[PDB]
Amino acid sequence: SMSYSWTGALVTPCAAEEQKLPINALSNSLLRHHNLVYSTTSRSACQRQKKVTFDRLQVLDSHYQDVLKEVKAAASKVKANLLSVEEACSLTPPHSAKSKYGYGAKDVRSHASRAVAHINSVWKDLLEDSVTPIDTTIMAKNEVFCVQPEKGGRKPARLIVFPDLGVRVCEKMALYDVVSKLPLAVMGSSYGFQYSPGQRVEFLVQAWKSKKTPMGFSYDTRCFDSTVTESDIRTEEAIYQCCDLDPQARVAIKSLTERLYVGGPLTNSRGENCGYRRCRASGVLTTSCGNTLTCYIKARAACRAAGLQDCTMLVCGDDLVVICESAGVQEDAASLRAFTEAMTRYSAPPGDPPQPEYDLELITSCSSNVSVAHDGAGKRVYYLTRDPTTPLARAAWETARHTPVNSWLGNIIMFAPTLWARMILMTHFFSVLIARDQLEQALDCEIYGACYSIEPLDLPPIIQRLHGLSAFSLHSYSPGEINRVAACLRKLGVPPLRAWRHRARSVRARLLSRGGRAAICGKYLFNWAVRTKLKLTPIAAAGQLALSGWFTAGYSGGDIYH
Ligand SMILES: CNC(=O)c1c(-c2ccc(F)cc2)oc2cc(N(Cc3ccc(B(O)O)c(F)c3)S(C)(=O)=O)c(C3CC3)cc12
């Protein structure tokens, strides 16, 4: 069937949509080529709609069915609980899209009468009605990028599809515990969201070293969400039901599957009927879990069909990497083509054909790659990095305009060991926070899809836990990485690293003078900026942190707040 059918009604905005990066002195201090920086808007929705709309032909085989059997068996070891209304309410972000039924996120979080009443009614309806499709809103995401005029110019807006706030709370009640436990149980070490960045590096390096002659590749499915079929989604439901569940949970999960997950009508912001969906909803609780599971099942089966030897897989939603034992250059190339053929049969062809890689650093996944630097003693330290263009562009926008979620803070946390995060992002934002008297204020940012409230002053212990102490002492970065950052700075009109160093010395001094947590920030985060270095010992606060739930699971599009 068609992933989508359209009525011709447009995807419409809620509020004003700024297309171009606004001119602001503080944002300009980071990046000056403002004309290159743009936000996606509803204006490009039509372009995206075209790409995501196609017929799915799915043909399953014995390998698929074998893997599915394994998965169901693994799932049967899981015990999952219902969340109470109150518990589910507290997982709702304060900035979450308000209900159409006279209440919003703040009302949900405060357990307000109107909100709780509607939520209760929605739950009752789920128990009583297992068939009637549930309404969804379609919106164009507003995301910031840098133009690549050589490479097709501006990206079209991604489409987000989500049900009412009331339904979203009920999803949590029925499935939060399931989507938090199941992927790990089924996938084990292949579940990508269980790892901190530091742990991820360790896993990848070990996997690579575990092969006599390693070969690895990334597999990029074209429009993964659209490739997800009705049968795929019903299979996901079947897997959920393998868990030991509460009777009411079983009913709600089935109802949510048949009425929401498998498909339903699309309504724009003006209340108009846009069409009908028969694939994955991008904005439901199960998006991450579902995508990861379905990608895993298909990929694991495809590995068998492709005759790949001693496969180690890593899966993050639709993002997939396989590391295996090389059979030879031509043999490997042929096996990869076979892998693609199998994935294609399963409904998931690639955007660009995958390529075998024999150097770990040459594999890119989730926009990131493994690179090498050196610690204070000259020991080689591996870390994850990425092209800084998008992070910097977004950082500039978020400086110029107040945003509910601060991507810059997340990038600093996740990419803390990188040359660019340390010298540019840290320097810039601490200078901005000082200037605006916002140093002590907690900010909202996303980590693996889940929204967290994080205080900037807690960055050093957070970074230590995620990356290790070495993150504050890395030097002698690779020529390739240095060159990539340099190229980015030239492109975007960002000041050179030596200028940032000078700025960092001033920022560091200011931070040290304030004492306490600020002083620890100055000491640890900006030790790179000074010749006369301070002794960076383990941070006491780091041990006192409880961060377990940071890397339990992925929640992208799942409307989760911790
Ligand atoms: C299967 N692919 C992988 O698991 C990952 C590889 C990888 C790279 C090269 C290779 F050879 C093998 C694997 O790099 C990664 C880096 C990230 N990060 C950044 C990040 C990227 C995207 C999102 B998001 O939009 O979902 C996000 F939330 C954070 S990080 C530094 O760890 O925090 C992640 C996070 C969990 C999603 C996964 C991988």
XYZ file of C-alpha atoms and ligand atoms in Angstrom:
601
model
C 0.000 0.000 0.000
C 0.890 3.679 -0.316
C 2.822 5.017 2.687
C 0.642 8.122 2.412
C -2.423 9.329 0.545
C -2.975 13.076 0.207
C -6.133 15.173 -0.162
C -4.267 18.204 -1.521
C -4.637 20.233 1.676
C -1.376 21.897 2.717
C 0.725 21.280 5.799
C 0.168 24.540 7.685
C 2.049 26.438 10.407
C 0.842 27.266 13.910
C 2.821 30.472 14.341
C 5.204 32.752 12.441
C 8.103 30.905 10.792
C 11.416 32.737 10.463
C 13.223 31.502 7.341
C 16.598 33.199 7.808
C 19.018 33.580 10.730
C 18.165 36.820 12.551
C 20.855 39.492 12.961
C 22.006 39.653 16.587
C 25.343 40.898 17.946
C 25.955 37.883 20.197
C 24.987 35.337 17.525
C 27.077 37.271 14.980
C 30.087 36.893 17.305
C 29.842 33.117 16.731
C 28.982 33.117 13.022
C 28.893 36.010 10.520
C 27.706 34.394 7.248
C 24.069 34.617 8.395
C 22.709 34.401 4.826
C 23.913 30.770 4.655
C 21.917 29.783 7.755
C 18.258 28.850 7.297
C 15.370 27.178 9.066
C 13.126 24.634 7.397
C 9.475 25.714 7.270
C 6.024 24.548 6.156
C 6.751 26.183 2.780
C 8.883 23.159 1.776
C 6.433 20.578 3.181
C 5.186 19.678 -0.312
C 8.690 18.653 -1.398
C 9.028 16.306 1.592
C 5.525 14.892 1.071
C 6.552 13.870 -2.455
C 9.684 12.012 -1.308
C 8.033 10.133 1.577
C 5.105 8.948 -0.570
C 5.459 5.566 -2.282
C 4.093 2.042 -2.599
C 5.587 -0.609 -0.354
C 6.263 -4.067 -1.660
C 7.332 -6.342 1.124
C 8.382 -9.949 0.759
C 9.453 -11.887 3.843
C 11.474 -15.115 3.959
C 12.700 -17.880 6.294
C 15.611 -15.796 7.622
C 13.241 -12.996 8.602
C 10.853 -15.438 10.288
C 13.773 -17.119 12.105
C 15.027 -13.810 13.517
C 11.478 -12.777 14.470
C 11.127 -16.032 16.427
C 14.366 -15.248 18.293
C 13.149 -11.734 19.068
C 9.798 -12.922 20.421
C 11.581 -15.495 22.600
C 13.874 -12.778 23.987
C 10.922 -10.440 24.572
C 9.200 -13.148 26.629
C 11.753 -12.616 29.424
C 10.580 -9.026 29.956
C 8.134 -7.979 32.658
C 6.599 -4.566 32.000
C 4.378 -2.421 34.224
C 1.605 0.083 33.688
C 2.390 3.671 34.585
C -0.164 5.585 36.626
C -1.710 8.750 35.202
C 0.371 10.802 37.647
C 3.613 9.053 36.600
C 2.841 9.451 32.895
C 1.895 13.106 33.447
C 5.302 13.836 35.004
C 7.078 12.454 31.913
C 5.418 15.158 29.778
C 7.700 18.036 28.688
C 6.515 21.516 29.784
C 6.816 22.697 26.162
C 4.779 19.754 24.797
C 2.082 20.579 22.235
C -1.145 21.557 24.003
C -4.316 19.505 23.705
C -7.142 20.484 21.366
C -9.503 19.812 24.292
C -8.847 22.922 26.388
C -5.602 22.201 28.243
C -1.825 22.155 27.817
C 1.445 20.639 29.021
C 1.569 22.755 32.205
C -1.910 21.524 33.132
C -0.858 17.907 32.571
C 2.253 18.341 34.744
C 0.215 19.963 37.551
C -2.391 17.153 37.354
C -5.123 19.720 36.620
C -8.764 18.582 36.684
C -9.620 19.210 33.020
C -6.424 17.543 31.793
C -6.703 14.459 34.022
C -10.411 14.134 33.171
C -9.681 14.022 29.434
C -6.746 11.630 29.907
C -9.009 9.295 31.908
C -11.660 9.443 29.166
C -9.063 8.666 26.484
C -7.861 5.636 28.459
C -11.446 4.415 28.894
C -12.008 4.824 25.155
C -8.854 2.781 24.419
C -10.252 -0.051 26.559
C -13.701 0.072 24.927
C -12.806 0.825 21.285
C -10.081 -1.160 19.480
C -10.838 -0.101 15.883
C -11.609 3.605 15.264
C -8.567 5.419 13.895
C -7.234 8.138 16.187
C -6.723 11.638 14.800
C -3.208 12.976 14.285
C -1.689 16.361 13.550
C 0.838 16.775 10.752
C 3.389 19.578 11.105
C 6.537 20.756 9.369
C 9.522 20.695 11.711
C 11.454 23.946 12.079
C 15.096 22.873 11.978
C 18.196 24.911 11.263
C 20.860 24.079 8.685
C 23.592 25.638 6.563
C 22.938 25.857 2.839
C 24.975 23.592 0.571
C 24.337 25.220 -2.845
C 26.611 22.737 -4.570
C 24.608 19.813 -3.124
C 20.923 20.566 -3.896
C 20.628 23.749 -1.849
C 18.054 23.774 0.944
C 16.716 20.680 2.699
C 12.945 20.265 2.802
C 11.258 20.251 6.196
C 10.851 16.923 7.953
C 7.262 16.038 8.798
C 6.164 15.262 12.340
C 2.968 13.279 12.906
C 1.562 13.148 16.440
C -1.689 12.470 18.299
C -3.341 14.676 20.899
C -1.625 15.374 24.238
C -4.264 13.238 25.984
C -3.420 10.221 23.832
C 0.320 10.848 24.326
C -0.084 10.519 28.107
C -2.004 7.255 27.606
C 0.799 5.948 25.375
C 3.201 6.461 28.271
C 0.838 4.659 30.633
C 0.597 1.643 28.335
C 4.092 1.464 26.841
C 6.748 3.620 28.559
C 8.030 0.663 30.576
C 7.915 -1.594 27.494
C 9.858 0.772 25.200
C 12.375 1.354 28.019
C 13.110 -2.354 28.679
C 12.352 -4.345 25.512
C 15.034 -3.229 23.029
C 17.887 -4.096 25.413
C 16.291 -7.460 26.226
C 15.887 -8.352 22.540
C 19.005 -6.788 21.046
C 21.589 -6.959 23.807
C 24.857 -5.260 22.835
C 23.396 -4.182 19.454
C 21.028 -1.706 21.145
C 22.736 1.633 20.503
C 20.919 3.832 23.029
C 22.252 1.884 26.049
C 25.701 3.437 25.591
C 27.149 6.721 26.742
C 29.411 8.272 24.063
C 32.497 6.924 25.856
C 30.962 3.453 26.122
C 29.972 3.589 22.449
C 33.571 4.281 21.395
C 34.790 1.413 23.549
C 32.234 -0.952 22.003
C 33.123 0.033 18.429
C 36.891 -0.212 18.946
C 36.512 -3.639 20.617
C 34.183 -4.863 17.845
C 36.688 -3.735 15.218
C 39.610 -5.366 17.040
C 37.579 -8.582 17.508
C 37.879 -9.414 13.782
C 40.977 -10.866 12.091
C 40.366 -8.616 9.089
C 37.495 -6.264 9.896
C 35.095 -4.910 7.330
C 32.367 -2.448 8.262
C 29.563 -0.470 6.691
C 26.735 1.918 7.448
C 23.313 1.220 5.930
C 21.103 4.235 5.205
C 17.503 3.297 4.431
C 15.717 5.814 2.217
C 12.822 7.354 4.169
C 12.816 4.608 6.818
C 9.574 5.743 8.462
C 7.736 5.394 5.134
C 9.242 1.935 4.513
C 7.663 0.667 7.730
C 4.607 -1.319 6.677
C 1.341 -2.094 8.420
C 2.509 -5.694 8.913
C 5.791 -4.411 10.434
C 3.807 -2.357 12.948
C 1.452 -5.234 13.787
C 4.539 -7.435 14.246
C 5.887 -4.867 16.720
C 2.624 -5.190 18.656
C 3.018 -8.987 18.657
C 6.504 -8.576 20.125
C 5.243 -6.178 22.835
C 2.629 -8.786 23.805
C 5.371 -11.397 24.396
C 6.159 -9.498 27.601
C 4.475 -10.236 30.910
C 1.932 -7.390 30.903
C -1.052 -6.170 32.933
C -4.409 -7.156 31.351
C -5.355 -3.504 30.755
C -1.950 -2.815 29.188
C -2.532 -5.642 26.687
C -5.842 -4.098 25.608
C -4.485 -0.537 25.387
C -1.406 -1.671 23.425
C -3.594 -3.470 20.861
C -5.945 -0.478 20.609
C -3.058 1.974 20.217
C -1.568 -0.270 17.527
C -4.747 -0.647 15.453
C -6.047 2.906 15.977
C -2.789 4.910 15.925
C 0.488 3.117 15.159
C -0.557 1.166 12.025
C -2.042 4.309 10.468
C -4.683 7.013 10.540
C -5.903 10.383 9.293
C -3.668 13.427 9.065
C -4.978 16.819 10.144
C -3.176 20.154 9.682
C -2.998 23.017 12.216
C -6.102 24.601 10.655
C -8.122 21.429 11.369
C -8.202 20.399 7.704
C -7.918 16.805 6.468
C -4.501 16.414 4.798
C -4.709 12.712 4.040
C -4.028 9.283 5.479
C -0.975 7.500 6.886
C -0.145 3.787 6.465
C 3.390 3.838 7.860
C 5.368 4.883 10.947
C 4.245 7.965 12.834
C 7.320 10.074 13.592
C 5.789 11.580 16.737
C 4.657 8.642 18.857
C 6.160 6.973 21.932
C 7.004 3.797 20.026
C 8.795 5.507 17.108
C 12.307 4.900 18.472
C 11.667 1.409 19.871
C 9.678 0.355 16.805
C 12.244 1.667 14.325
C 15.154 0.101 16.221
C 13.402 -3.286 16.496
C 12.231 -3.363 12.874
C 15.623 -2.214 11.571
C 17.339 -4.844 13.756
C 15.079 -7.699 12.624
C 15.409 -6.819 8.936
C 19.169 -6.206 9.196
C 19.885 -9.376 11.183
C 17.968 -11.425 8.606
C 19.646 -9.587 5.711
C 23.088 -10.364 7.201
C 22.238 -14.067 6.990
C 20.929 -13.821 3.426
C 24.040 -11.811 2.470
C 26.333 -14.497 3.921
C 28.153 -11.998 6.128
C 30.525 -13.671 8.589
C 30.758 -13.003 12.335
C 28.523 -9.925 12.274
C 28.514 -7.393 15.075
C 25.626 -4.962 14.657
C 24.840 -1.609 16.222
C 21.376 -0.104 15.807
C 19.968 3.327 16.692
C 16.469 3.627 15.255
C 16.910 3.622 11.472
C 20.698 4.106 11.816
C 22.565 0.846 11.308
C 26.213 -0.226 11.322
C 27.548 -3.717 10.698
C 31.092 -4.821 11.510
C 32.079 -8.245 10.191
C 34.856 -10.642 9.208
C 36.128 -9.821 5.703
C 35.810 -12.493 3.009
C 38.012 -10.538 0.578
C 37.475 -7.296 -1.360
C 35.299 -8.611 -4.199
C 33.594 -11.111 -1.887
C 32.723 -8.326 0.564
C 31.449 -6.043 -2.207
C 29.201 -8.828 -3.501
C 27.935 -9.661 -0.001
C 27.011 -6.003 0.587
C 25.015 -5.953 -2.663
C 23.285 -9.131 -1.421
C 22.597 -7.413 1.923
C 20.986 -4.472 0.124
C 18.904 -6.829 -2.037
C 17.582 -8.558 1.094
C 16.838 -5.273 2.889
C 15.097 -4.044 -0.268
C 12.904 -7.164 -0.348
C 12.031 -6.435 3.299
C 10.874 -2.976 2.106
C 13.981 -0.977 3.125
C 16.145 0.033 0.138
C 18.988 2.500 0.664
C 19.155 6.154 -0.286
C 22.782 5.725 -1.338
C 24.274 2.256 -1.859
C 26.332 1.107 1.127
C 30.100 0.821 0.739
C 32.497 -1.566 2.475
C 35.075 0.145 4.686
C 38.343 -1.288 6.010
C 39.235 1.676 8.233
C 37.069 2.249 11.336
C 37.408 6.048 11.064
C 35.906 5.970 7.540
C 32.494 4.769 8.749
C 29.900 7.480 9.337
C 26.688 6.833 11.268
C 24.302 9.162 13.104
C 26.321 11.907 11.348
C 29.330 10.887 13.454
C 32.683 9.152 13.118
C 35.458 7.793 15.291
C 38.605 9.892 15.477
C 41.792 9.851 17.536
C 43.443 12.378 19.813
C 46.012 12.228 22.617
C 45.719 12.673 26.377
C 48.152 14.447 28.714
C 50.516 11.452 28.819
C 50.546 10.982 25.015
C 48.197 7.986 25.096
C 45.916 7.547 22.090
C 42.304 8.332 22.972
C 39.404 7.521 20.680
C 36.298 9.708 20.579
C 33.224 10.428 18.491
C 33.025 13.562 16.393
C 31.065 15.054 13.511
C 31.076 17.904 11.023
C 30.421 20.994 13.199
C 28.429 22.913 10.557
C 24.918 22.025 11.748
C 25.810 22.311 15.472
C 27.327 25.769 14.911
C 24.448 26.988 12.713
C 21.944 25.912 15.377
C 24.077 27.413 18.146
C 23.946 30.751 16.302
C 20.157 30.590 15.938
C 19.694 29.632 19.598
C 21.849 32.604 20.645
C 19.757 35.007 18.567
C 16.412 33.550 19.652
C 15.082 31.853 22.766
C 14.146 28.253 21.989
C 12.347 25.656 24.137
C 15.075 23.072 23.511
C 18.754 24.039 23.381
C 20.623 21.812 20.902
C 23.887 23.587 21.795
C 23.901 22.197 25.345
C 23.275 18.668 24.061
C 26.076 19.011 21.519
C 28.491 20.243 24.195
C 27.573 17.237 26.352
C 27.617 14.598 23.601
C 30.622 15.988 21.706
C 32.604 17.284 24.721
C 35.978 15.775 23.672
C 35.897 17.382 20.219
C 38.126 20.304 19.226
C 35.109 22.321 18.064
C 32.839 21.733 21.078
C 35.635 22.698 23.480
C 37.153 25.716 21.756
C 34.033 27.214 20.162
C 30.762 26.001 21.734
C 31.965 26.016 25.359
C 33.734 29.371 25.020
C 30.812 30.988 23.209
C 27.987 29.825 25.458
C 29.755 30.447 28.772
C 30.522 33.967 27.484
C 26.856 34.385 26.474
C 25.522 33.000 29.771
C 27.801 35.364 31.724
C 26.724 38.319 29.575
C 23.022 37.530 30.038
C 23.293 36.638 33.731
C 21.963 33.140 32.966
C 24.838 31.069 34.406
C 22.796 29.551 37.259
C 19.667 28.830 35.196
C 18.720 25.285 34.189
C 18.185 24.696 30.459
C 16.205 22.150 28.480
C 18.099 19.969 26.015
C 17.624 16.617 24.294
C 19.718 13.500 24.924
C 18.885 10.529 22.669
C 15.455 12.093 22.044
C 14.567 12.555 25.722
C 14.312 16.085 27.129
C 16.414 16.880 30.209
C 16.670 19.941 32.434
C 20.388 20.545 32.823
C 22.319 23.236 34.664
C 25.352 24.500 32.666
C 27.344 24.622 35.912
C 27.035 20.802 36.125
C 28.803 20.299 32.761
C 32.203 19.187 34.131
C 30.962 16.211 36.202
C 28.525 15.265 33.441
C 31.352 15.288 30.876
C 33.640 13.275 33.166
C 31.000 10.555 33.536
C 30.152 10.377 29.821
C 33.652 10.719 28.364
C 36.253 10.298 31.116
C 38.732 12.773 32.606
C 40.736 12.679 29.356
C 38.036 14.806 27.682
C 39.526 17.862 29.437
C 43.117 17.139 28.341
C 42.837 16.032 24.699
C 45.375 17.463 22.259
C 47.166 16.570 19.012
C 43.950 16.018 17.072
C 44.071 14.370 13.640
C 44.912 16.426 10.517
C 41.639 15.326 8.915
C 39.585 16.543 11.876
C 41.505 19.824 12.149
C 41.015 20.405 8.407
C 37.276 19.674 8.590
C 36.789 22.145 11.443
C 38.922 24.749 9.629
C 36.846 24.363 6.449
C 33.646 24.815 8.459
C 34.901 28.023 10.093
C 35.818 29.541 6.715
C 32.444 28.571 5.239
C 30.317 29.919 8.102
C 32.376 33.030 8.901
C 33.290 31.783 12.379
C 36.374 33.344 14.016
C 39.534 31.212 13.992
C 40.460 28.914 16.875
C 43.236 31.240 18.116
C 40.662 34.029 18.544
C 38.438 31.658 20.533
C 41.433 30.712 22.680
C 41.956 34.381 23.545
C 38.258 34.734 24.405
C 38.363 31.517 26.460
C 41.166 32.905 28.646
C 38.890 35.819 29.627
C 35.877 33.534 30.156
C 38.002 31.145 32.230
C 39.238 34.003 34.420
C 35.673 35.219 35.051
C 34.531 31.696 35.945
C 37.448 31.091 38.337
C 36.686 34.350 40.176
C 33.064 33.373 40.931
C 34.244 30.243 42.753
C 32.352 27.022 43.435
C 30.847 25.177 40.464
C 31.696 28.076 38.144
C 35.348 27.753 39.214
C 35.288 24.038 38.380
C 33.917 24.959 34.936
C 36.767 27.429 34.412
C 39.370 24.958 35.677
C 38.336 21.827 33.774
C 36.516 23.044 30.649
C 39.135 25.687 29.736
C 42.459 24.127 30.810
C 43.223 23.872 27.068
C 43.298 27.683 26.810
C 46.227 28.148 29.230
C 49.916 27.224 29.006
C 50.374 27.040 32.777
C 48.020 24.110 33.273
C 46.106 23.135 36.402
C 46.026 19.586 37.766
C 42.792 17.927 36.640
C 41.849 15.342 39.264
C 38.608 13.353 39.411
C 35.643 15.589 40.190
C 33.950 14.717 43.488
C 30.508 15.740 42.219
C 30.834 13.286 39.315
C 30.585 10.285 41.640
C 27.522 11.770 43.345
C 25.651 11.994 40.019
C 22.911 9.501 39.232
C 22.815 9.339 35.421
C 21.705 5.728 34.817
C 18.459 6.644 33.065
C 20.300 8.924 30.627
C 21.330 5.927 28.553
C 18.567 3.413 29.113
C 16.793 4.017 25.807
C 16.041 6.220 22.807
C 12.897 8.374 22.883
C 13.064 10.500 19.714
C 9.622 11.883 18.847
C 8.279 10.220 22.001
C 7.446 13.353 23.987
C 9.598 12.325 26.982
C 10.872 14.522 29.816
C 13.144 13.340 32.639
C 24.497 2.853 14.716
N 25.299 4.072 14.910
C 25.686 4.430 16.125
O 25.383 3.767 17.122
C 26.498 5.644 16.320
C 27.709 5.972 15.827
C 28.665 5.249 14.980
C 29.602 6.008 14.264
C 30.563 5.362 13.484
C 30.603 3.963 13.448
F 31.532 3.339 12.702
C 29.684 3.207 14.188
C 28.720 3.853 14.970
O 28.097 7.208 16.303
C 27.101 7.702 17.111
C 27.013 8.898 17.803
C 25.880 9.190 18.551
N 25.973 10.423 19.223
C 25.459 11.712 18.732
C 24.011 11.657 18.340
C 23.631 11.492 17.005
C 22.273 11.450 16.667
C 21.299 11.578 17.667
B 19.790 11.524 17.280
O 19.331 12.386 16.323
O 19.124 10.342 17.460
C 21.685 11.748 19.002
F 20.758 11.869 19.972
C 23.042 11.795 19.333
S 26.914 10.371 20.697
C 28.497 11.172 20.350
O 27.166 9.027 21.108
O 26.246 11.090 21.729
C 24.820 8.259 18.645
C 23.574 8.556 19.459
C 22.825 7.447 20.127
C 22.244 8.119 18.933
C 24.923 7.048 17.933
C 26.064 6.773 17.165
